[PDB]
Structure formats: structure tokens, C-alpha cells
Amino acid sequence: MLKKKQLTVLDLHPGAGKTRRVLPEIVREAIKKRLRTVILAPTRVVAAEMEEALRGLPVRYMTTAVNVTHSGTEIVDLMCHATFTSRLLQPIRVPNYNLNIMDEAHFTDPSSIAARGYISTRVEMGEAAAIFMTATPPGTRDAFPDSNSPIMDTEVEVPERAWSSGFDWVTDHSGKTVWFVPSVRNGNEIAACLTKAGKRVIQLSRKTFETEFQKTKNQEWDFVITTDISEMGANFKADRVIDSRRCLKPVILDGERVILAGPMPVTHASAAQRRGRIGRNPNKPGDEYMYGGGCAETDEGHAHWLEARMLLDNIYLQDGLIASLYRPEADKVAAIEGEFKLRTEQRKTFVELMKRGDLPVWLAYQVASAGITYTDRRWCFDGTTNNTIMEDSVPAEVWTKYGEKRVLKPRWMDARVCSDHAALKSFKEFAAGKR
Ligand SMILES: CS(=O)(=O)N[C@@H]1CCOc2ccccc21
């Protein structure tokens, strides 16, 4: 595995012990062989779990999710997938790691796809070794993989809205349930319904993940309503997974806008990861998995692969060369390598719109490629009337940095900036010049 020029895919089933058993073994061997090593966690919650599994070993934790006093002589760095990609984009120097380990190497966020592309290109070049750890590698057709104990799989109609009758089996359960919903807004409705019926509900999403996940250990709950974020190593002490089998897909229409299409079928990798939450205790067989639809390869034409190409086109590799996407996922986008390469000033704007502006990659690229400086927010108000952002069936309004009251009408419309109350609130602050 550790020998150069090689990319290994560690494809053990969910719960096989890739993070607590296999990962420390690789770390010990890497330290023994003096290989400068990077460990890539998908989220800060997995980083905290990796610290527990690697406790004692000399690892430099490049995250505030862990409170450790470093000796300064560690040759193994641990950071999130997005931190790795972010530091690659910024002027800061990143070591040319001899060994690159990616946990949950199935994560389809644009920064995870970009990191895989960068690492795999370095391996293809014969510069480094890499290990991609995942139960569901890119290209998996099995939604029912092995587990530590048997799982009862049941195809059933799963409600995607509040209900008065017809789904007795959902509330007539005395155990703990993790329920995957296609969106935050869809989860709010089902959560309000379960709460009204006397259930204790915790809700998880990308923006509230670290805070609310802690509640699943600190308090007694009946249901956990989550988006696809819990597919990335999140572990619960539950006996049932209710899976709508649906997700929202960002799609770039005619290269002019981004809409959130669907809800539509999840990939086999996602369905397997969602099912993978239960059947993890070999001493407690019989965990249930209720699924409400089929799988399809909805990652083809998904905006994240185009966005990954926008990140890689702006990461230095060697002179004019540009990193390719990891081979099993390179056909999910019809992009020309190098087409999103920006000049130095616009690239600096692109990076800042993502890091500080917190804008989606596609939106940041449209603003930076137009030659607009980071603090220039006039574009948030000069788009056509069909780009009017709506809040509560009425146009959203903001006070500009000039003190004028204006309707939010962005020149480039990206549905992710107003997909929920929290996203819209952050976009309003950005359009007003608050960050
Ligand atoms: C994220 S932090 O505040 O905990 N600092 C970490 C740990 C020490 O090593 C490094 C190196 C570079 C950058 C961040 C860090």
C-alpha cells in the first residue's frame, strides 16, 4: 500500500473498521517509513473520531475540532477534505505528501472530488502513494452491501410530507430511527409532524452538523431527520433507517443559472451509505431499513463535478499542467480541462468569494470571471426580474452598503443561495456588504 506510484482503494463494507482498526495500522507504518502523510477527514465530527482512534500517535491536527498540544515534530497531518483543497488554492505552500489517505472517499462535495483529482494525478505522475477508504467507491452498483449483523430490507412508501393517516408503521416503533430526507425544508415538515405526535426529533444539515450531532449523544431522541450529510461517517445508536431514497440535484441550465432539480433518486453509493448507518452491531441483529424508491446514476450532469473542474483548473500542479478528475468519476462532466483557468487577480477574487463570501463554486466563478472585485456587490441587484429572490411568497429585500433599500435580484441566479431560511439570511448579509 505505502509503496510509491500506487493508488489503493480500501473497499471494506460499512462497519468493517476502516477508521478505528485499519487507519492506525497505516499511520504506524507510515511513521516507521518516514513518509510525510496527510489524512483527509470529510467533516470535523469524523476528525474528532479519528483523534480517538489515533490517540497517542504523533499526528498534527490542522482543525479546531480537536484540542491537542502538538510536539511540533509530527510528520502526519490530519485535515478536512475542504481544508486541503482550500490550502491548495491559496498562496500558502502545501507539502508534497508522500502518502495521501482519504477517509469517506465517496464524498461528492466539489472540494472532495477536486482533492481526489489532485491526489490521483500526483499518483499517476509517480510522485506519491494514495489510499482511498470507502465502502462505496465511485462506480458502485450495490445498494445492499455486507454489514456486521443482518438487516431487514423493506421496500415501502415513505412519506415526504406531514400525514394524518396511512403510515402507522413510522410512529408504532419503540426504538430509535434515522430518517434521510431530500431537503432541509422537507425535513422541517416531517419533523413538525413527528413532534406534534409526541416524538423527540433532532434535525441535521450541512450548516448545523457539528452542533446538532452532539445532541444525539447528550440527549434521548426518537428520530433524527437528516439530509445526505449523515452518509459521511456519522454514527448513531439506532435500530432503524427510514430512507426516502431521494435527493436534490444542483443543475446548471444553459450555463446561465443553477436550479435545485428533483427530489430525484439517490445513487447506489448513497443508498448503501444510508443503509450502512444500521446493522453495525454484530450482537444486535434485526435492524430495519425501509426504503421508498429506487436508485439511479444521478451524479451525471450534477453541478459538483463541473465545480470540481473549476477548482482544479485554478490549482497549481507543475508549470502549465492541470490535474484531471479521478478516472472512475471523470465522465460525470463534459468539461474541457483548463477552460475555467483564471488570471491571478480574478483567481484571488474566486478564492475569496468562496472562503469569505461563502458562495457556491459556480456562483463565485461567474462573479470572478466577470472581473468584479470581492467587495463590489452591485451584481446582487442588477439581474433580470426572473432572478428576483422570493421570501415568504414576497420579494426579499436588503439595505445595500449605500443605505438604499433594494430587492435581491442577482445577475447570476444560484438556487443554493436561497434553498432555506439560513442560506437566504447569509446571502442577504453578503448582498448588503456585511462580510
Ligand atoms: C487549526 S489549529 O488552530 O488547531 N492549528 C493547527 C494545529 C497545529 O498545526 C497547524 C499547522 C498549520 C495550520 C494549522 C495548524
Side-chain angles (χ1 to χ4, degrees):
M1 282 198 228
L2 269 58
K3 284 188 170 197
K4 204 140 263 176
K5 314 206 177 190
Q6 177 145 82
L7 201 157
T8 304
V9 182
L10 187 63
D11 61 328
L12 305 190
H13 72 78
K18 293 175 302 296
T19 308
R20 298 205 77 95
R21 176 191 94 241
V22 187
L23 183 61
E25 283 172 351
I26 294 162
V27 171
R28 259 172 231 115
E29 197 185 331
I31 289 170
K32 175 183 173 78
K33 291 165 173 196
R34 309 297 202 271
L35 302 183
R36 187 70 160 106
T37 302
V38 71
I39 307 179
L40 297 181
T43 69
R44 278 164 50 107
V45 157
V46 163
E49 286 155 2
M50 278 168 149
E51 190 274 327
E52 255 180 281
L54 299 156
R55 192 159 297 163
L57 284 164
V59 178
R60 171 183 298 102
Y61 292 89
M62 298 172 58
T63 171
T64 52
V66 153
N67 180 61
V68 297
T69 299
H70 301 95
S71 72
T73 61
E74 300 87 351
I75 59 163
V76 178
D77 295 340
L78 190 151
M79 71 184 80
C80 283
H81 297 200
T83 298
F84 179 73
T85 303
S86 179
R87 293 168 78 87
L88 285 177
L89 280 147
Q90 293 180 264
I92 180 213
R93 117 198 82 240
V94 171
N96 287 312
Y97 300 101
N98 309 123
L99 180 58
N100 303 270
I101 311 160
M102 177 177 283
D103 198 17
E104 314 297 353
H106 64 276
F107 199 9
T108 57
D109 270 17
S111 73
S112 300
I113 306 159
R116 293 196 289 276
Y118 180 90
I119 290 165
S120 50
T121 304
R122 287 197 62 241
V123 172
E124 186 191 6
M125 277 172 164
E127 301 299 322
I131 296 146
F132 284 179
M133 309 208 294
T134 177
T136 65
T140 175
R141 307 185 172 162
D142 197 357
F144 305 91
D146 288 341
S147 55
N148 297 339
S149 69
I151 296 169
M152 329 285 294
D153 293 312
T154 301
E155 188 188 69
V156 72
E157 189 73 32
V158 169
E160 293 185 18
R161 299 284 188 277
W163 65 95
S164 294
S165 68
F167 301 99
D168 278 14
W169 65 264
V170 171
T171 53
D172 290 330
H173 188 251
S174 42
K176 310 218 293 185
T177 293
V178 182
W179 191 330
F180 288 85
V181 293
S183 77
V184 170
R185 290 187 165 168
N186 274 167
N188 294 334
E189 183 169 340
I190 296 169
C193 185
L194 299 169
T195 293
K196 189 176 182 184
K199 306 293 171 188
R200 285 155 295 174
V201 179
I202 296 169
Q203 284 180 253
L204 306 172
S205 60
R206 267 171 181 81
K207 290 299 221 166
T208 59
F209 200 58
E210 200 176 20
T211 313
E212 304 301 301
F213 184 79
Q214 179 62 48
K215 304 191 169 174
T216 72
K217 319 180 301 197
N218 177 32
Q219 67 201 82
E220 319 171 340
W221 52 273
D222 291 319
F223 285 85
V224 154
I225 307 304
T226 172
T227 59
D228 66 336
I229 190 58
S230 289
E231 287 171 27
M232 258 52 65
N235 284 299
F236 307 91
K237 213 272 280 296
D239 66 338
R240 180 173 77 166
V241 160
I242 289 178
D243 188 6
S244 61
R245 287 265 195 106
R246 313 237 285 167
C247 63
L248 282 180
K249 172 180 183 189
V251 170
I252 309 163
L253 293 178
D254 296 25
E256 260 175 82
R257 65 202 298 117
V258 170
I259 68 152
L260 275 157
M264 73 182 59
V266 301
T267 68
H268 295 81
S270 286
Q273 288 297 340
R274 289 172 176 203
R275 184 181 170 264
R277 292 318 95 221
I278 48 80
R280 307 183 71 98
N281 185 339
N283 298 143
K284 297 191 209 156
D287 294 352
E288 303 166 340
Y289 173 70
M290 262 88 164
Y291 60 109
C295 300
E297 292 305 304
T298 53
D299 283 354
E300 326 278 332
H302 182 312
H304 292 174
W305 280 271
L306 200 277
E307 292 180 298
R309 280 259 39 100
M310 294 173 157
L311 299 171
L312 285 171
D313 280 355
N314 290 285
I315 285 168
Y316 178 80
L317 185 68
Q318 173 160 310
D319 292 336
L321 307 177
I322 287 186
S324 290
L325 292 176
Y326 176 39
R327 200 23 263 175
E329 43 182 356
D331 283 331
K332 309 197 167 175
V333 60
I336 304 176
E337 295 165 342
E339 84 173 293
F340 306 115
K341 181 177 167 172
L342 298 169
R343 275 299 292 118
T344 299
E345 285 311 316
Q346 298 180 354
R347 175 178 314 186
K348 281 199 167 293
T349 310
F350 174 45
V351 170
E352 192 166 27
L353 289 161
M354 296 183 286
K355 186 162 188 45
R356 201 190 311 282
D358 192 34
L359 302 189
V361 179
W362 178 94
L363 187 58
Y365 179 86
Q366 302 311 123
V367 177
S369 61
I372 295 167
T373 56
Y374 174 76
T375 57
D376 189 357
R377 309 283 151 87
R378 294 174 289 176
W379 70 269
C380 300
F381 311 100
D382 66 10
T384 68
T385 195
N386 58 322
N387 285 3
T388 299
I389 293 161
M390 305 291 290
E391 180 186 354
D392 304 327
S393 321
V394 100
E397 290 173 3
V398 316
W399 277 275
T400 76
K401 80 197 199 183
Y402 295 96
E404 189 168 68
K405 182 76 154 330
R406 297 188 78 178
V407 155
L408 221 53
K409 227 161 54 178
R411 207 189 297 174
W412 303 276
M413 182 63 229
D414 185 316
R416 293 169 290 190
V417 312
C418 54
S419 60
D420 54 54
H421 171 84
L424 184 47
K425 184 185 170 285
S426 168
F427 193 59
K428 290 164 66 160
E429 293 166 335
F430 179 85
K434 302 289 188 127
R435 70 174 188 276

PDB file of all heavy atoms in Angstrom, residues 60-66 68 70 77 87 92, ligand 1:
ATOM      1  N   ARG A  60      -0.419  15.807  13.703  1.00  0.00           N
ATOM      2  CA  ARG A  60      -0.695  17.237  13.748  1.00  0.00           C
ATOM      3  C   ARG A  60      -2.104  17.451  13.207  1.00  0.00           C
ATOM      4  O   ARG A  60      -2.386  17.187  12.029  1.00  0.00           O
ATOM      5  CB  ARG A  60       0.328  18.000  12.896  1.00  0.00           C
ATOM      6  CG  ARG A  60       0.034  19.481  12.673  1.00  0.00           C
ATOM      7  CD  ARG A  60       1.064  20.146  11.763  1.00  0.00           C
ATOM      8  NE  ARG A  60       2.403  20.109  12.351  1.00  0.00           N
ATOM      9  CZ  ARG A  60       3.364  19.255  11.999  1.00  0.00           C
ATOM     10  NH1 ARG A  60       3.149  18.361  11.038  1.00  0.00           N
ATOM     11  NH2 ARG A  60       4.541  19.278  12.616  1.00  0.00           N
ATOM     12  N   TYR A  61      -3.005  17.857  14.091  1.00  0.00           N
ATOM     13  CA  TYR A  61      -4.411  18.070  13.789  1.00  0.00           C
ATOM     14  C   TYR A  61      -4.624  19.504  13.346  1.00  0.00           C
ATOM     15  O   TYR A  61      -4.641  20.417  14.176  1.00  0.00           O
ATOM     16  CB  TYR A  61      -5.266  17.757  15.028  1.00  0.00           C
ATOM     17  CG  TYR A  61      -5.266  16.281  15.373  1.00  0.00           C
ATOM     18  CD1 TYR A  61      -4.312  15.747  16.221  1.00  0.00           C
ATOM     19  CD2 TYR A  61      -6.170  15.410  14.782  1.00  0.00           C
ATOM     20  CE1 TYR A  61      -4.262  14.385  16.482  1.00  0.00           C
ATOM     21  CE2 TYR A  61      -6.145  14.053  15.054  1.00  0.00           C
ATOM     22  CZ  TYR A  61      -5.176  13.539  15.888  1.00  0.00           C
ATOM     23  OH  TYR A  61      -5.140  12.189  16.162  1.00  0.00           O
ATOM     24  N   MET A  62      -4.787  19.702  12.029  1.00  0.00           N
ATOM     25  CA  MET A  62      -4.998  21.013  11.428  1.00  0.00           C
ATOM     26  C   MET A  62      -6.473  21.316  11.352  1.00  0.00           C
ATOM     27  O   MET A  62      -7.032  21.484  10.270  1.00  0.00           O
ATOM     28  CB  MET A  62      -4.318  21.064  10.068  1.00  0.00           C
ATOM     29  CG  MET A  62      -2.836  20.878  10.214  1.00  0.00           C
ATOM     30  SD  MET A  62      -1.898  20.700   8.701  1.00  0.00           S
ATOM     31  CE  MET A  62      -2.307  22.210   7.874  1.00  0.00           C
ATOM     32  N   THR A  63      -7.110  21.329  12.534  1.00  0.00           N
ATOM     33  CA  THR A  63      -8.525  21.598  12.756  1.00  0.00           C
ATOM     34  C   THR A  63      -8.755  22.013  14.214  1.00  0.00           C
ATOM     35  O   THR A  63      -8.122  21.463  15.128  1.00  0.00           O
ATOM     36  CB  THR A  63      -9.397  20.380  12.362  1.00  0.00           C
ATOM     37  OG1 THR A  63     -10.750  20.607  12.781  1.00  0.00           O
ATOM     38  CG2 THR A  63      -8.879  19.059  12.931  1.00  0.00           C
ATOM     39  N   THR A  64      -9.682  22.969  14.445  1.00  0.00           N
ATOM     40  CA  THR A  64     -10.020  23.346  15.831  1.00  0.00           C
ATOM     41  C   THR A  64     -11.053  22.391  16.463  1.00  0.00           C
ATOM     42  O   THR A  64     -11.472  22.631  17.586  1.00  0.00           O
ATOM     43  CB  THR A  64     -10.437  24.811  15.956  1.00  0.00           C
ATOM     44  OG1 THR A  64     -11.467  25.081  15.003  1.00  0.00           O
ATOM     45  CG2 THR A  64      -9.266  25.771  15.764  1.00  0.00           C
ATOM     46  N   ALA A  65     -11.457  21.315  15.760  1.00  0.00           N
ATOM     47  CA  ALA A  65     -12.378  20.317  16.294  1.00  0.00           C
ATOM     48  C   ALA A  65     -11.706  19.391  17.349  1.00  0.00           C
ATOM     49  O   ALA A  65     -12.391  18.575  17.972  1.00  0.00           O
ATOM     50  CB  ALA A  65     -12.927  19.471  15.161  1.00  0.00           C
ATOM     51  N   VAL A  66     -10.371  19.506  17.514  1.00  0.00           N
ATOM     52  CA  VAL A  66      -9.545  18.732  18.424  1.00  0.00           C
ATOM     53  C   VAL A  66      -8.671  19.723  19.236  1.00  0.00           C
ATOM     54  O   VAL A  66      -8.119  20.670  18.667  1.00  0.00           O
ATOM     55  CB  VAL A  66      -8.719  17.732  17.568  1.00  0.00           C
ATOM     56  CG1 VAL A  66      -7.406  17.347  18.228  1.00  0.00           C
ATOM     57  CG2 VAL A  66      -9.544  16.497  17.221  1.00  0.00           C
ATOM     58  N   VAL A  68      -5.504  19.640  21.101  1.00  0.00           N
ATOM     59  CA  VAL A  68      -4.290  18.921  21.500  1.00  0.00           C
ATOM     60  C   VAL A  68      -3.059  19.815  21.464  1.00  0.00           C
ATOM     61  O   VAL A  68      -2.964  20.720  20.629  1.00  0.00           O
ATOM     62  CB  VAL A  68      -4.058  17.596  20.712  1.00  0.00           C
ATOM     63  CG1 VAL A  68      -5.172  16.588  20.966  1.00  0.00           C
ATOM     64  CG2 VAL A  68      -3.890  17.855  19.219  1.00  0.00           C
ATOM     65  N   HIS A  70       0.462  19.994  20.345  1.00  0.00           N
ATOM     66  CA  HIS A  70       1.413  19.377  19.430  1.00  0.00           C
ATOM     67  C   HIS A  70       2.881  19.509  19.831  1.00  0.00           C
ATOM     68  O   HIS A  70       3.300  20.548  20.323  1.00  0.00           O
ATOM     69  CB  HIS A  70       1.197  19.919  18.011  1.00  0.00           C
ATOM     70  CG  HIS A  70      -0.189  19.667  17.509  1.00  0.00           C
ATOM     71  ND1 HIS A  70      -1.180  20.621  17.623  1.00  0.00           N
ATOM     72  CD2 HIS A  70      -0.723  18.547  16.968  1.00  0.00           C
ATOM     73  CE1 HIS A  70      -2.275  20.064  17.125  1.00  0.00           C
ATOM     74  NE2 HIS A  70      -2.049  18.816  16.724  1.00  0.00           N
ATOM     75  N   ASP A  77      -0.153  14.865   9.011  1.00  0.00           N
ATOM     76  CA  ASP A  77      -1.143  15.921   9.185  1.00  0.00           C
ATOM     77  C   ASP A  77      -2.544  15.379   8.963  1.00  0.00           C
ATOM     78  O   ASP A  77      -2.771  14.600   8.043  1.00  0.00           O
ATOM     79  CB  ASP A  77      -0.913  17.053   8.161  1.00  0.00           C
ATOM     80  CG  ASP A  77       0.392  17.792   8.337  1.00  0.00           C
ATOM     81  OD1 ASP A  77       0.967  17.725   9.439  1.00  0.00           O
ATOM     82  OD2 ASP A  77       0.856  18.405   7.361  1.00  0.00           O
ATOM     83  N   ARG A  87      -6.381  25.153   1.002  1.00  0.00           N
ATOM     84  CA  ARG A  87      -4.966  25.499   1.125  1.00  0.00           C
ATOM     85  C   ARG A  87      -4.235  25.335  -0.205  1.00  0.00           C
ATOM     86  O   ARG A  87      -3.362  26.147  -0.497  1.00  0.00           O
ATOM     87  CB  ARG A  87      -4.300  24.746   2.282  1.00  0.00           C
ATOM     88  CG  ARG A  87      -4.846  25.204   3.632  1.00  0.00           C
ATOM     89  CD  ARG A  87      -4.434  24.281   4.773  1.00  0.00           C
ATOM     90  NE  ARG A  87      -3.060  24.519   5.195  1.00  0.00           N
ATOM     91  CZ  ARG A  87      -2.692  25.428   6.093  1.00  0.00           C
ATOM     92  NH1 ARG A  87      -3.591  26.228   6.643  1.00  0.00           N
ATOM     93  NH2 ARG A  87      -1.418  25.561   6.423  1.00  0.00           N
ATOM     94  N   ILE A  92      -0.458  29.942   0.156  1.00  0.00           N
ATOM     95  CA  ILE A  92       0.231  29.087   1.114  1.00  0.00           C
ATOM     96  C   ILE A  92       0.782  27.789   0.495  1.00  0.00           C
ATOM     97  O   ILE A  92       0.141  27.165  -0.344  1.00  0.00           O
ATOM     98  CB  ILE A  92      -0.673  28.802   2.334  1.00  0.00           C
ATOM     99  CG1 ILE A  92       0.080  27.903   3.347  1.00  0.00           C
ATOM    100  CG2 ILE A  92      -2.052  28.280   1.904  1.00  0.00           C
ATOM    101  CD1 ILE A  92      -0.625  27.017   4.083  1.00  0.00           C
TER     102      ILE A  92
HETATM  103  C1  LIG B   1      -6.323  24.603  13.369  1.00  0.00           C
HETATM  104  S1  LIG B   1      -5.369  24.929  14.802  1.00  0.00           S
HETATM  105  O1  LIG B   1      -5.646  26.273  15.215  1.00  0.00           O
HETATM  106  O2  LIG B   1      -5.540  23.859  15.742  1.00  0.00           O
HETATM  107  N1  LIG B   1      -3.793  24.876  14.326  1.00  0.00           N
HETATM  108  C2  LIG B   1      -3.291  23.658  13.671  1.00  0.00           C
HETATM  109  C3  LIG B   1      -2.575  22.703  14.632  1.00  0.00           C
HETATM  110  C4  LIG B   1      -1.058  22.826  14.557  1.00  0.00           C
HETATM  111  O3  LIG B   1      -0.586  22.682  13.210  1.00  0.00           O
HETATM  112  C5  LIG B   1      -1.164  23.532  12.297  1.00  0.00           C
HETATM  113  C6  LIG B   1      -0.429  23.810  11.152  1.00  0.00           C
HETATM  114  C7  LIG B   1      -0.957  24.656  10.203  1.00  0.00           C
HETATM  115  C8  LIG B   1      -2.227  25.176  10.350  1.00  0.00           C
HETATM  116  C9  LIG B   1      -2.974  24.859  11.467  1.00  0.00           C
HETATM  117  C10 LIG B   1      -2.449  24.038  12.462  1.00  0.00           C
END
